[PDB]
């Protein structure tokens, strides 16, 4: 019901326009007070974020807390996960710092994202690659987290499909260490 929109360091859409999106025709179906508290903070301080969330959940009975910004930090999504799992409030990520992908979540959380799972991009690029008839392929990756899952999913997808991928060599190198082997 009650919606919490929290925009930090955002200058795209005015507050009057933000509450203009709350169309009366959209409100048809649910007669309860869908209080859309759209708050524009000129900062993104985590302590002030928690204070604002607690005050708004005390005063307006938040049901859906949608958070978007223009930042480039993925930590805000994890703190939203923590607050969701603690204070029993749902939060969804939209734009900016909330836009990037979340890897794994604690089961007790009530969080939602827009970013797609790495498996989804994997299958999408595999099928666009088969669409352009580039059956020949080779895989390379670094030791950035999530590579075990990516390589395992790619291998399993290679196993099942009828197209017949040719994994000539799959390599997980690290250019930070000895470059000679990487070039080799």
């Amino acid at each position: 019901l009650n919606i919490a929109v929290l925009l930090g360091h955002s200058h795209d859409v005015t507050e009057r326009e933000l509450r203009n999106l709350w169309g009366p025709e959209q409100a048809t179906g649910l007669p309860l007070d869908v209080n859309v508290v759209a708050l524009l903070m000129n900062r993104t301080d985590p302590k002030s974020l928690i204070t604002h969330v607690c005050d708004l959940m005390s005063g307006a009975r938040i049901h859906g807390l949608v958070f978007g910004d223009d930042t480039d930090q993925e930590a805000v999504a994890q703190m939203l996960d923590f607050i969701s799992s603690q204070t029993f409030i749902p939060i969804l990520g939209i734009h900016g710092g909330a836009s990037m992908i979340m890897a794994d979540k604690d089961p007790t959380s009530t969080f939602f994202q827009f970013g797609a799972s790495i498996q989804q991009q994997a299958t999408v690029m595999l099928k666009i690659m088969q669409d352009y008839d580039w059956h020949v392929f080779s895989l390379v990756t670094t030791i950035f987290p999530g590579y075990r899952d990516f390589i395992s999913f790619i291998k399993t997808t290679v196993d099942n499909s009828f197209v017949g991928w040719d994994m000539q060599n799959v390599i997980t190198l690290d250019t930070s260490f000895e470059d000679a082997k990487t070039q080799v």
């Binding site: 933000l18 999106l21 859906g64 827009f114």
Partner: peptide
């Protein structure tokens, strides 16, 4: 971004309904 706002509001309203 506004399309995402509309989509997220739709998600939460559908869940609440």
């Amino acid at each position: 971004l506004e399309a995402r706002v509309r989509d997220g509001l739709g998600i939460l309203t559908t869940a609440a309904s």
